[PDB]
Amino acid sequence: CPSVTPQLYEKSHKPSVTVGMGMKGSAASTACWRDQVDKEEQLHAIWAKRYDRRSNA
Amino acid sequence: VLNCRPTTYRRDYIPTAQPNEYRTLSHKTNLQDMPPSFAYSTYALDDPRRIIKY
Amino acid sequence: REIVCVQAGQCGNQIGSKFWEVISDEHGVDPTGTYQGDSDLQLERINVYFDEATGGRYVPRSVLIDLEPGTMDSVRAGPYGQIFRPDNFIFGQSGAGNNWAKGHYTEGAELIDSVLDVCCKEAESCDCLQGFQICHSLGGGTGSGMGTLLISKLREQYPDRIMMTFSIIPSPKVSDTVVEPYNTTLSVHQLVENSDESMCIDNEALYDICFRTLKLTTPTFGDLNHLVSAVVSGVTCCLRFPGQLNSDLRKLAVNLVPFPRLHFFMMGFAPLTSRGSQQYRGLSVPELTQQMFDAKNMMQAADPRHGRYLTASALFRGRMSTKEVDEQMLNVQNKNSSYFIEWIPNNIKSSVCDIPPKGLKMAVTFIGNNTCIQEMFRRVGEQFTLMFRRKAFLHWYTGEGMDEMEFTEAESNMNDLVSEYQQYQDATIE
Amino acid sequence: REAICIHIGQAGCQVGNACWELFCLEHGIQPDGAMPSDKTIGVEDDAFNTFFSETGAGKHVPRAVFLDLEPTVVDEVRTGTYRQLFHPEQLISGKEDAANNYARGHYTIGKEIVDLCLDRIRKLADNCTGLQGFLVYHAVGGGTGSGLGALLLERLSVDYGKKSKLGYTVYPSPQVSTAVVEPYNSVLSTHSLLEHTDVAAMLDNEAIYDLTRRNLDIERPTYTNLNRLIGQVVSSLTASLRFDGALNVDLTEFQTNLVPYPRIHFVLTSYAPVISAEKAYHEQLSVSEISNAVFEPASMMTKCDPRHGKYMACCLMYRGDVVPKDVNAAVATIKTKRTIQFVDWSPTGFKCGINYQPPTVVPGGDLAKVQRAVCMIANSTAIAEVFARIDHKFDLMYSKRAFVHWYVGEGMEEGEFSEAREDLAALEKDYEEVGAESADMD
Amino acid sequence: REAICIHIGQAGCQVGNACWELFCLEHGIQPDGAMPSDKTIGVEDDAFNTFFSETGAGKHVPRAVFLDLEPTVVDEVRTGTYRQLFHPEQLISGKEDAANNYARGHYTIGKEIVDLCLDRIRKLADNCTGLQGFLVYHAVGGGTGSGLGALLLERLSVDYGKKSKLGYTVYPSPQVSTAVVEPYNSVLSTHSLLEHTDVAAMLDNEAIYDLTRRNLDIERPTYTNLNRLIGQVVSSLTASLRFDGALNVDLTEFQTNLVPYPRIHFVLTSYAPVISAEKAYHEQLSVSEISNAVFEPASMMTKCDPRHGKYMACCLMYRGDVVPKDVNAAVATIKTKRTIQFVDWSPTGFKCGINYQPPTVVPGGDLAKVQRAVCMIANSTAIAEVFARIDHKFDLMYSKRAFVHWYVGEGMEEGEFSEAREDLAALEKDYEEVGAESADMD
Amino acid sequence: SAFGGLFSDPPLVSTDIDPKKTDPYDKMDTIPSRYLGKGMSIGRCP
Amino acid sequence: PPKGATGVWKPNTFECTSVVQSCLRRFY
Ligand SMILES: Nc1nc2c(ncn2[C@@H]2O[C@H](COP(=O)(O)OP(=O)(O)OP(=O)(O)O)[C@@H](O)[C@H]2O)c(=O)[nH]1
Ligand SMILES: Nc1nc2c(ncn2[C@@H]2O[C@H](COP(=O)(O)OP(=O)(O)OP(=O)(O)O)[C@@H](O)[C@H]2O)c(=O)[nH]1
Ligand SMILES: Nc1nc2c(ncn2[C@@H]2O[C@H](COP(=O)(O)OP(=O)(O)O)[C@@H](O)[C@H]2O)c(=O)[nH]1
Ligand SMILES: [Mg+2]
Ligand SMILES: [Mg+2]
């Protein structure tokens, strides 16, 4: 192998199935990452609405 | 005593369906008076959730 | 899924005229041809029997053929006669003479090309063609000869479709013509090869229906042709209206015929009951099934108790529960178990349709495939052999040109049909 | 997250109407013109996503196809007030039926229509990001349901591979019958379904009629009642995907827990608080009563008796106001009973699920309102008796080739009958062998 | 900046009417060539300049000539609604048609009219300062379109030299046909077109009929629908010249990127959101769905199947609200598919362009309104199948000299048939050779 | 033909009869080399 | 007959309804 680290190079070419945390270039990974960031924003919004009433001031 | 005759689907699942809401209608009925509806949606363009505040 | 009708001979043209009155009434078509109905369910399957002419009008998909125009002028003079397309009336210049061979070979080949041209022209215009429907008598002359000629030609040209015939057959006692056995035997020989499914009616059975069940004081041919039009319009009802368990002519044929020669069926219609008497009947599925199996309501002279049911089918019209139908058919099969052929685990098919015939709350039509029809064929073969052994009237047919070997072949084929019915009647598991 | 529904033939479309009526009413999908004009839940939540996709203008559309060879039933859905929902491409209808012939559906007619169905399913499957199975509704007694169902599952199994396929199937009842040729079609169907399905749910119409007579008070039931019961069962099984709960259960957990060996995938289904409104106000309905109820044969939706066999696995789905401690007490009481028996090689026989959403009430419906319900799917050797009776009826007819000429005319070799009958015989022998104790002399 | 349009014969003039209708409606020029007198946006932008020139009084006039040998179509233009838009010198008409004879157009009749055409084109080219190509619309099936189109392209190619010439050509459909002598005219046209055109776009009426039946809901289409689709395609291709964008594409970049070898210049064209109004409101139309759409054969406007060949290059033009990251993800997903194949000597198969101006909606039109669209032109070896069927029909007719006496009487040697057929045979062999997988690397 | 009314059925890219030419839904693809591995180990000062 | 497939002429077909249909309003 031309790489200094052989294990990383070998693991890179092994095919993968997880399309979760944004790693792929396909459309599914992008859509899922967008869903995750939207969900995080919504959850923070609701929690701030229900506990932190003095944030905006 | 046999003037009204429904079929089973219309009698069970969609009983309140008037004759004016089916695909086939006469050619001399007005269309402007009928409200527009061409899809199914949770809200009727309701302001509580569609508006984004800022 | 559209049916094309052919009406042949006097009996066929009269029954057809009454049939198209009944069908036009059920779909709300005025005698001018204008649609005047009051629900889309009537309109949405009108194509099945009618073609659409320009601005409203409907025309009925039927061909009328006869050898003397007297009948044609009578139907054209009738109350709905105007609806028929003028170019669809085909007639010759000399009568059938009540002779099968003349009607089949001499005037038949003269006219047959124009009827086949019209029938092909009408069939090929359809986007998908279902079977043909033919009404004729088997005892006559032009009905038997030209009907079977046309049947053979349509079977050559459209072998992948379904072929259905409705046929009137001679009473053993009430003959209308002396030479009935020859015409009947030759026509049944032709039909058993060409046809896919054939329905048979005895005028004697209709007479006994009218007198015993309807108690009519002075019945007329309009009543008999109304009974026939009722059963005919009932068989096609699942083709043209919604229901909980749809059915089709091809689905009926596949479930009714165990072997391809066994395709002759008896018919009945249940909510028959005479005017005036306070008893209503037919208000529930047990009443219809009990009347349905009563021999008073069956359209053949043979009685089921002398034979066995291979298969049966019931088509129900009206708003009803499937349980009452299913449990009634099970109870009838269990209680009368000796009359059902034992190597088939369930002999009855049921079907349920939402839309009843006009003026009845509910109705059912019954179709039965029973081996007792063999007694009728035996009867025809006996009368034929009595006449043929003595050369009783053969010179007319031979003068038209038939070889006697056709008569001996047709007799042998009918005798083999009788033998096949008898062997399947007496078969056993062993 | 996503699931795609495929409806085939007459039973599958009629059950589909009830299913989509129920899922609409549970989520709140209404006509856009028809404003609620009333108090509603009013909480914008992701739960629709399992069954709906948004256009971005906020219209909802459902993840379903309707497949039929005769026009009448699909043309009936195109004419109602439910036309506004489906995308018109989703409603696919042919010209003419398969006429109760499996050979006609599989070889002659379904072969023309099948490529449109696969293209539509692909267009659906491309608009997903966590598809976790197909739900299929069909009957194996009729011609198009058998032939096109087999052909479509074969193509799906090659193209999509490992993805799970769960079927809800209406089988021919053991003595109520509607058509003569039912045994031939059911045997030939079952041959294809054996190889190409991950879980198969078993239904008998005679059992659901008996259940509606005994428990509900209906003298004259009709197909809409049975289809509403089926819809409730499907809603209970898919509720685990759609709402919050204490113990969730993903659809892959059913397949991992219920199927011990790859051929042993035919399962029985039952539902507990099937009760009428007049009885419902006379009785409390605690957890232990409904847990005891689901094991009585009067509760089952398939006509088989489990006392003549042994359980291999049970999966119990509880929905509504239930607490895990009561589930544990109920399961321990069930475990004590002597008329409930498990094969000795399956010691931990139960899986539990607990979901907070109670079952919905439909305005025209016949079920009562209840705070909790439980639904069971279980694997048992008793199922072998249903196949033995179908095979005996097939043998009776096939000894004389009673109807074979239709099938031979529509394109099938006579040899195919004997192959299918031997494969179902081998399935019977599998159920005989698997249930035999591995006792060892010592 | 500038482009000159040349319209030849009946199909080319009728398609021109739809094109200039569309270009007027996109810029906002009234049918009489005057800008809206009541509109006061103030930013009198230069975008028209690609297609219009100003006099100085503010009337607009378009950079086109209409050429025909029969009067009727040009008199229809003269008497129609756009009478005042065109300069009367631009509308050139002969006395009598070429009667489906290539020989009549090329030798006998077009030779008198051709010098007026060259004088008009010169008068246009003198009123330019950055001419960057010719757009030509014609059909190769008819006599004047074939003969005069070839003669005029030859003369333009000698006089102007290096300037690019792009043709939009309606070829004879593989079983739809309108005249008996179509194969002879198409062979003789293609012989001249091979030497003297830079890119040739292929159209089949049978494909646009199929597209209008399947995707749109039109039962009875006519030529105006096809001509509006062609006009939309041409507007999409020329939009890159007229409006701001992220990745512009000059007409010379198309020519540089699409043609690998100087004979291999025949390209396929497709358009994505061909959709009806009822389907369009049921579905979202994101970038990945339309990118998947442009590769399905149901979208193409030419009757060929690309699975029997290999793609060499694709040029994808996106217009409307699209973001480059979505284009990159889409192209990588298309590249992943196994039923889409590129020749192994072309690893980097795609060129992208992205423009912000969305497609215009025409008052009488049949397309839905959409926020974005994509248009593709692609080079593929499958086109060799299109030539082989024309050559087979030529061989069938030519074996008996079925009609040749007309051509010989109007001035053509019999030898020209065999020469042209041998040149098309060589073009077939070129497409066989370029598409062969080279095994020298392994 | 099968669709009805069209001159000819359009070819299909998604699916195929031949199992060795059809297009599987679950493409089994490659992970980028960046998001794997450990990375540099960096120490603070106590 | 010119040694062909019999002296019979097959009439044409009028309409060809498709598989998927629209759900927009339809008039009598
Ligand atoms: N539970 C339930 N069973 C049904 C329903 N409709 C039909 N069945 C049963 O299913 C069997 C008939 O199968 P069908 O669905 O009619 O067959 P098919 O799919 O229409 O096949 P074709 O007749 O060729 O069109 C019988 O046992 C019926 O009792 C229904 O709506 N609900
Ligand atoms: N798409 C499209 N094709 C057309 C149109 N008009 C004609 N065609 C096609 O083009 C071919 C006929 O070519 P024409 O334009 O009529 O030939 P021409 O240029 O008039 O040549 P002459 O007959 O000698 O005057 C046929 O294949 C027609 O189908 C049109 O308006 N639109
Ligand atoms: N049911 C019924 N039977 C008829 C009618 N007309 C004639 N028949 C019977 O048909 C047989 C006569 O056949 P026919 O039609 O005269 O033969 P044709 O001379 O060839 O037309 C006799 O049994 C008649 O009773 C009719 O209108 N209805
Ligand atoms: Mg059916
Ligand atoms: Mg011309």
Short mmCIF file of all heavy atoms in Angstrom, two decimals, chain E residues 9-11 14-15 70 97-100 139 142-145 178 182 205 223 226-227, ligand 2:
data_model
loop_
_atom_site.label_atom_id
_atom_site.label_comp_id
_atom_site.label_asym_id
_atom_site.label_seq_id
_atom_site.Cartn_x
_atom_site.Cartn_y
_atom_site.Cartn_z
N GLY E 9 -38.60 26.09 -45.38
CA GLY E 9 -39.76 25.24 -45.57
C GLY E 9 -40.84 25.32 -44.49
O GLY E 9 -40.83 26.17 -43.60
N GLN E 10 -41.73 24.35 -44.56
CA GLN E 10 -43.02 24.43 -43.87
C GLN E 10 -42.87 24.16 -42.38
O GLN E 10 -43.30 24.97 -41.55
CB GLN E 10 -44.02 23.45 -44.48
CG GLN E 10 -45.43 23.66 -43.95
CD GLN E 10 -46.49 23.26 -44.93
OE1 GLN E 10 -47.40 24.04 -45.22
NE2 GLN E 10 -46.40 22.05 -45.45
N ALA E 11 -42.24 23.04 -42.03
CA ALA E 11 -41.99 22.73 -40.62
C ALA E 11 -41.11 23.79 -39.98
O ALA E 11 -41.36 24.19 -38.84
CB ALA E 11 -41.34 21.36 -40.50
N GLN E 14 -43.21 27.07 -39.47
CA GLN E 14 -44.22 26.90 -38.44
C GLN E 14 -43.61 26.77 -37.04
O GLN E 14 -44.14 27.33 -36.08
CB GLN E 14 -45.12 25.71 -38.78
CG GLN E 14 -45.97 25.98 -40.01
CD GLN E 14 -47.00 24.91 -40.28
OE1 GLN E 14 -46.78 23.73 -40.02
NE2 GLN E 14 -48.14 25.32 -40.81
N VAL E 15 -42.50 26.04 -36.90
CA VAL E 15 -41.79 26.03 -35.62
C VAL E 15 -41.22 27.40 -35.29
O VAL E 15 -41.18 27.80 -34.11
CB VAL E 15 -40.69 24.95 -35.66
CG1 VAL E 15 -39.76 25.07 -34.47
CG2 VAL E 15 -41.30 23.57 -35.70
N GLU E 70 -42.94 27.78 -51.74
CA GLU E 70 -44.37 28.01 -51.94
C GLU E 70 -44.81 29.25 -51.17
O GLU E 70 -44.29 29.53 -50.09
CB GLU E 70 -45.18 26.79 -51.52
CG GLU E 70 -45.07 26.40 -50.05
CD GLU E 70 -45.55 24.99 -49.79
OE1 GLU E 70 -46.08 24.36 -50.72
OE2 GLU E 70 -45.39 24.50 -48.65
N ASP E 97 -43.48 24.95 -55.51
CA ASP E 97 -42.82 24.12 -54.51
C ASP E 97 -41.83 23.17 -55.18
O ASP E 97 -41.79 23.03 -56.40
CB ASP E 97 -43.86 23.34 -53.72
CG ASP E 97 -44.72 22.46 -54.60
OD1 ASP E 97 -44.94 22.84 -55.77
OD2 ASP E 97 -45.18 21.40 -54.12
N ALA E 98 -41.01 22.53 -54.35
CA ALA E 98 -40.10 21.50 -54.82
C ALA E 98 -40.71 20.10 -54.86
O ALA E 98 -39.97 19.14 -55.11
CB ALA E 98 -38.84 21.49 -53.96
N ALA E 99 -42.02 19.97 -54.62
CA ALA E 99 -42.78 18.77 -54.97
C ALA E 99 -42.14 17.49 -54.43
O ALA E 99 -42.08 16.46 -55.11
CB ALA E 99 -42.98 18.67 -56.48
N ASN E 100 -41.64 17.55 -53.19
CA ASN E 100 -40.92 16.46 -52.54
C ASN E 100 -39.70 15.99 -53.31
O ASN E 100 -39.21 14.88 -53.07
CB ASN E 100 -41.84 15.26 -52.25
CG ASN E 100 -42.81 15.53 -51.14
OD1 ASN E 100 -44.02 15.43 -51.32
ND2 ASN E 100 -42.29 15.88 -49.97
N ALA E 139 -36.89 20.57 -41.95
CA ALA E 139 -37.14 19.14 -42.06
C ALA E 139 -36.44 18.56 -43.28
O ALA E 139 -36.44 19.17 -44.35
CB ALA E 139 -38.64 18.85 -42.14
N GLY E 142 -38.82 16.74 -46.78
CA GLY E 142 -39.39 17.37 -47.95
C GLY E 142 -38.35 17.91 -48.93
O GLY E 142 -37.16 17.97 -48.65
N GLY E 143 -38.85 18.30 -50.10
CA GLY E 143 -37.98 18.61 -51.21
C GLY E 143 -37.23 19.93 -51.07
O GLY E 143 -36.01 19.98 -51.22
N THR E 144 -37.96 21.01 -50.77
CA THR E 144 -37.31 22.31 -50.63
C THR E 144 -36.48 22.40 -49.36
O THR E 144 -35.36 22.92 -49.40
CB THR E 144 -38.35 23.44 -50.71
OG1 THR E 144 -37.67 24.70 -50.81
CG2 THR E 144 -39.27 23.47 -49.50
N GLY E 145 -36.95 21.81 -48.26
CA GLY E 145 -36.15 21.78 -47.05
C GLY E 145 -34.83 21.07 -47.23
O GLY E 145 -33.78 21.66 -46.99
N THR E 178 -45.12 10.25 -43.57
CA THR E 178 -46.02 11.22 -44.17
C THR E 178 -45.98 11.19 -45.69
O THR E 178 -46.99 11.48 -46.33
CB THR E 178 -45.69 12.63 -43.65
OG1 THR E 178 -45.88 12.67 -42.24
CG2 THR E 178 -46.58 13.68 -44.28
N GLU E 182 -39.69 9.81 -48.49
CA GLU E 182 -38.90 10.29 -47.36
C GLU E 182 -37.49 9.69 -47.23
O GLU E 182 -36.56 10.46 -46.92
CB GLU E 182 -39.67 10.09 -46.05
CG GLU E 182 -40.82 11.05 -45.87
CD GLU E 182 -41.77 10.61 -44.78
OE1 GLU E 182 -41.50 9.57 -44.14
OE2 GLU E 182 -42.78 11.30 -44.56
N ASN E 205 -41.33 12.94 -34.53
CA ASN E 205 -42.69 13.31 -34.17
C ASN E 205 -43.36 12.24 -33.32
O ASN E 205 -44.18 12.55 -32.45
CB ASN E 205 -43.51 13.55 -35.44
CG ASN E 205 -43.09 14.81 -36.16
OD1 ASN E 205 -42.39 15.65 -35.60
ND2 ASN E 205 -43.52 14.95 -37.40
N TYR E 223 -49.83 19.72 -34.39
CA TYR E 223 -48.49 20.25 -34.60
C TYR E 223 -48.14 21.46 -33.74
O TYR E 223 -46.97 21.66 -33.41
CB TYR E 223 -48.29 20.63 -36.07
CG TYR E 223 -48.22 19.48 -37.04
CD1 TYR E 223 -48.86 19.55 -38.26
CD2 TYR E 223 -47.48 18.35 -36.75
CE1 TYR E 223 -48.78 18.51 -39.16
CE2 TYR E 223 -47.39 17.31 -37.64
CZ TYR E 223 -48.04 17.39 -38.85
OH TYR E 223 -47.97 16.34 -39.73
N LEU E 226 -46.37 20.29 -30.56
CA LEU E 226 -44.99 19.89 -30.81
C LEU E 226 -44.11 21.11 -31.02
O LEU E 226 -42.98 21.18 -30.52
CB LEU E 226 -44.93 18.97 -32.03
CG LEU E 226 -45.36 17.51 -31.95
CD1 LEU E 226 -46.85 17.35 -31.71
CD2 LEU E 226 -44.95 16.77 -33.21
N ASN E 227 -44.62 22.09 -31.77
CA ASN E 227 -43.84 23.28 -32.06
C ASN E 227 -43.60 24.11 -30.80
O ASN E 227 -42.52 24.69 -30.64
CB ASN E 227 -44.56 24.11 -33.11
CG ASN E 227 -44.66 23.40 -34.44
OD1 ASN E 227 -44.05 22.35 -34.64
ND2 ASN E 227 -45.43 23.96 -35.36
N1 LIG H 2 -42.92 18.97 -35.97
C1 LIG H 2 -43.46 19.39 -37.11
N2 LIG H 2 -43.28 18.66 -38.27
C2 LIG H 2 -43.81 19.07 -39.43
C3 LIG H 2 -44.55 20.24 -39.48
N3 LIG H 2 -44.96 20.41 -40.76
C4 LIG H 2 -44.50 19.38 -41.51
N4 LIG H 2 -43.79 18.55 -40.69
C5 LIG H 2 -43.10 17.30 -41.06
O1 LIG H 2 -42.05 17.51 -42.00
C6 LIG H 2 -42.15 16.59 -43.07
C7 LIG H 2 -42.70 17.29 -44.30
O2 LIG H 2 -41.78 18.29 -44.66
P1 LIG H 2 -42.29 19.66 -45.29
O3 LIG H 2 -41.89 20.82 -44.41
O4 LIG H 2 -43.78 19.63 -45.52
O5 LIG H 2 -41.50 19.75 -46.68
P2 LIG H 2 -41.34 21.18 -47.39
O6 LIG H 2 -40.27 21.97 -46.69
O7 LIG H 2 -42.65 21.91 -47.42
O8 LIG H 2 -40.84 20.79 -48.87
P3 LIG H 2 -41.86 20.90 -50.10
O9 LIG H 2 -42.98 19.91 -49.91
O10 LIG H 2 -41.13 20.63 -51.39
O11 LIG H 2 -42.42 22.30 -50.14
C8 LIG H 2 -43.09 15.51 -42.60
O12 LIG H 2 -42.38 14.54 -41.88
C9 LIG H 2 -44.02 16.26 -41.68
O13 LIG H 2 -44.51 15.40 -40.68
C10 LIG H 2 -44.74 20.98 -38.33
O14 LIG H 2 -45.39 22.01 -38.36
N5 LIG H 2 -44.19 20.55 -37.15
#
